[PDB]
């Protein structure tokens, strides 16, 4: 019942998985060895065997072994099914071309084989939670190949998309927009609701809120895990208003192509800071709409809200939710599209947030998960399109994509598709 198969592609995907399962084993009380010391709250994410062992339903796919066989050496080496974590021989070279045609071709058939052997025990499979990065070669090419076959083998099943998106300023590779643009066909055609992750915005989040001067990506991971667990909170624990994963995405999506909502989490706050605040429902409600708390470097005040979903968890009373949202609709600075004078979807869960012992996040009795679609997010693509022009105008690095079996015009279809998406997110704002 209510099972979800999590897919982890690329270095970013596999390591964000390492952090997510680190959070899940703690919140559901499983040791790193898979045992339960002493409700079926784990059936959503973990499978059970006769010996009392919790086996996650997850696949780690990387075209290179270093990160995954590092996982084979870490504390979670025995938690995972060893041959459901698949390693390739040749890295993706930050190239969508080989990852989509050349190197992922020989390995994808085993990946779908393991997906099938994960699906056949799920009696109530709810959806898919695939993790990757746009800029990475694996997270672009292999995901592009994989959602294609998943959409024809599991067409009815929902496919939530949690992807890591490049920053306006911070970047790790010059070819990142090339990988990002050929991913856009996958999210538009073979995804049901995509969640985009910006590293620089959350860098600002941890700089300002967590007061930590020197966090790593592991600190980024130990909050992406919270956002995904909060999205999955209603499926695993009891709540006064439990939101089904299908109910969720029906509430987000106004049109089949408009399914790209922003995400924010509250309260992101350090342990030294949690003490001096009462941390009411109202202020965590007010903090979410603050542009200084957005996960993507775009100003919501530059845009218009279409769908709003209040995913509260912990000791939160729905009356306080109504009182907060009355204030939210009271201010004019937050102007919603003329589509939704009802505005808000409310979801409340009884489980307080679970704290990572090595994390930088404080223990708070209340936590809220904010997921909202808005027209302001097109700016996060409005710099990437001008960016892609700035390389494609000479055919900057295409000889590699051409040399690995990509048609030259696939870039033309790519920027045509992103232009279509950018237009689609502008007409709905009128």
């Amino acid at each position: 019942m209510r099972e979800c198969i999590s897919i982890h592609v690329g270095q970013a995907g596999v390591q964000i998985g390492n952090a997510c399962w680190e959070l899940y084993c703690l919140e559901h009380g499983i040791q790193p060895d898979g045992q339960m010391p002493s409700d079926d709250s784990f059936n959503t994410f973990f499978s059970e065997t006769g010996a009392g062992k919790h086996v996650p339903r997850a696949v780690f796919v990387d075209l290179e072994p270093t990160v995954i066989d590092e996982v084979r050496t870490g504390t979670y080496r025995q938690l995972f099914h060893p041959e459901q974590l698949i390693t390739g021989k040749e890295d993706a070279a930050n190239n969508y071309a080989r990852g989509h045609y050349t190197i992922g071709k020989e390995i994808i058939d085993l990946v779908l084989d393991r997906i099938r052997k994960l699906a056949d025990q799920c009696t109530g499979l709810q959806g898919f939670l695939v993790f990757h990065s746009f800029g990475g070669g694996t997270g672009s090419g292999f995901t592009s190949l994989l959602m294609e076959r998943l959409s024809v083998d599991y067409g009815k099943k929902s496919k939530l998309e949690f992807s890591i998106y490049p920053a306006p300023q911070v970047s790790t590779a010059v070819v990142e927009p090339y990988n990002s643009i050929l991913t856009t066909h996958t999210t538009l055609e073979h995804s049901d609701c995509a969640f985009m992750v910006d590293n620089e915005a959350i860098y600002d989040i941890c700089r300002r809120n967590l007061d930590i001067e020197r966090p790593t990506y592991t600190n980024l991971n130990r909050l992406i895990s919270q956002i995904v667990s909060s999205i999955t909170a209603s499926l695993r624990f009891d709540g006064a208003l439990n939101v089904d994963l299908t109910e969720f995405q029906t509430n987000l999506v106004p049109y089949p192509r408009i399914h790209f909502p922003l995400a924010t989490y509250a309260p992101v706050i350090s342990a030294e800071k949690a003490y001096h605040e009462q941390l009411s429902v109202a202020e965590i409600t007010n903090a979410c709409f603050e542009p200084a708390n957005q996960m993507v470097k775009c100003d919501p005040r530059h845009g218009k809200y279409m769908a709003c979903c209040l995913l509260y968890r912990g000791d939160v009373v729905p009356k306080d939710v109504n009182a907060a949202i009355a204030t939210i609709k009271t201010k004019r600075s937050i102007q919603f599209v003329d589509w939704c004078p009802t505005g808000f979807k409310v979801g409340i869960n009884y489980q307080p947030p679970t704290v990572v012992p090595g994390g930088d996040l404080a223990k708070v009795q209340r936590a809220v998960c904010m997921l909202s679609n808005t027209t302001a997010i097109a700016e996060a693509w409005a710099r990437l399109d001008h960016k892609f022009d700035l390389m494609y105008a000479k055919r900057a690095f295409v000889h590699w994509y051409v040399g690995e079996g990509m048609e030259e015009g696939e870039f033309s279809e790519a920027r045509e598709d992103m232009a279509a998406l950018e237009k689609d997110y502008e007409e709905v704002g009128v």
Binding site: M1, G124, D238, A240, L241, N242, D244, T246, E247, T250, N251, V253, P254, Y255, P256, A307, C308, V317, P318, K319, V321, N322, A326, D338, W339, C340, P341, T342, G343, F344, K345, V346
Partner: protein, 426 residues
């Protein structure tokens, strides 16, 4: 003897119906395990109205619990009185409706309607003389509004003559928790008007207004709103479970309360209502019950009666009282406030009195009203529907279930027709 068969739809419906079952089990003195523990024999003669006699002198309520998710069934069975219910009437699917009316009415609930019908039919044949069906559901979302209307239509089709009374908690603008409520409400009232003989409209906002501005609760939870609903739930059927000087069962109300067949969405209310620190000071006399009863604050919907005219009002009093003051208040209310009651129909009040008051109460009054002001919620639902109808949002999640545009158009047209009839006699 006038058996009444209960059906729960949606999480709202089954939890408020479960708390109603708790309340009337206390009124009838029924142990949580189902055994009888009441004090007087008066709790015992009309047990057949709500409960089935079984071996060991234990009593099982005639309730059919319907949902599309097992989580609500898990909560209700693990609740205070989960064990008293029939394991067979827990009829439920696995995949939820996702607040989709089309899902519940065409795909998700259509497969379970066969499994609910074989249970409701056996419950009805278990009855000696069936009177009707009291169904609890929510106009919000796609479970209660979706499958509830379908199975209501089915039971109306196969039971054409029995009383059909439904208590419906319905969406509201300022305390809305789901985006897609207005679609659900418009597609639900379409069937409610055509099939139901009786519908009680309940709005959450006025329940909140009662619990703050009258009950003075700092943290009234959702169960307190369930309690406010269940008070009138028990009140409306008091006369056919207990003796009283003026006996008025459901059809007694019906023949007096709905002038034209389609004007059957009504206004519930209950008295007395006090805070914890103010009941010590209040004089619970019947005239004061009346002055509290027709107050716009005592009602359970945002439709203020001063914006319309009462067609018919039902005041089912309860307790050991005489009745000349009952008549004098029921005439004074409609005389001094004759501008709020249709002068063209002179005596707008139906009076019923029961001899046994609620446990812990010396007396009680239950309010049922037909006001033209109830169109406030209907036209507002239609306006919000139009704000999400006129140029096509969210329809892919209905049309993907086989739902079609023209049926939405007819549903909106029928909302407009209803608000037209209710403004006609104002």
């Amino acid at each position: 003897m006038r058996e009444i068969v209960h059906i729960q739809a949606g999480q709202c419906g089954n939890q408020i119906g479960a708390k109603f079952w708790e309340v009337i089990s206390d009124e009838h003195g029924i142990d949580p395990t189902g055994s009888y523990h009441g004090d007087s024999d008066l709790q015992l003669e009309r047990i057949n109205v709500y409960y089935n006699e079984a071996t060991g002198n234990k009593y099982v309520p005639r309730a059919i619990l319907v949902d599309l998710e097992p989580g609500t069934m898990d909560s209700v069975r693990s609740g205070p009185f989960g064990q008293i219910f029939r394991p067979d009437n827990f009829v439920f699917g696995q995949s939820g409706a996702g607040n989709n009316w089309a899902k519940g009415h065409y795909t998700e609930g259509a497969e379970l309607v066969d499994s609910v019908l074989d249970v409701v039919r056996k419950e009805s044949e278990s009855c000696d003389c069936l009177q009707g069906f009291q169904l609890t559901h929510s106009l919000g979302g796609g479970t209660g509004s979706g499958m509830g209307t379908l199975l209501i239509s089915k039971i109306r089709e196969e039971y054409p003559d029995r009383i059909m009374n439904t208590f419906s908690v319905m969406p509201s603008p300022k305390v809305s928790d789901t985006v897609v409520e207005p679609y659900n409400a418009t597609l639900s009232v379409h069937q409610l008007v055509e099939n139901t003989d009786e519908t009680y409209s309940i709005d959450n906002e006025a329940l909140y207004d009662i619990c703050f501005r009258t009950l003075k609760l700092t943290t009234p939870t959702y169960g307190d709103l369930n309690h406010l609903v269940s008070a009138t739930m028990s009140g409306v059927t008091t006369c056919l479970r207990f003796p009283g000087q003026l006996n008025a069962d459901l059809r007694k109300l019906a023949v007096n309360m709905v002038p034209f067949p389609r004007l059957h969405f009504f206004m519930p209310g209950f008295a007395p209502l006090t805070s914890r620190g103010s009941q010590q000071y209040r004089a619970l006399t019947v005239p004061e019950l009346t002055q509290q009863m027709f107050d716009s604050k005592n009602m359970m919907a945002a439709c203020d009666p001063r914006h319309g005219r009462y067609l018919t009002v039902a005041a089912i009093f309860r307790g050991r009282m005489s009745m000349k003051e009952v008549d004098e208040q029921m005439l004074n209310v409609q005389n001094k406030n004759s501008s709020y009651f249709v002068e063209w129909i002179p005596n707008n009040v139906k009076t019923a009195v029961c001899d046994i008051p609620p446990r812990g109460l010396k007396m009680s009054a239950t309010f049922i009203g037909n006001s033209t002001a109830i169109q406030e919620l209907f036209k507002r639902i239609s306006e919000q529907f139009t704000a999400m109808f006129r140029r096509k949002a969210f329809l892919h999640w209905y049309t993907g279930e086989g739902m079609d545009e023209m049926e939405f158009t007819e549903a909106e047209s029928n909302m407009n027709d209803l608000v037209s009839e209710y403004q006609q006699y104002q």
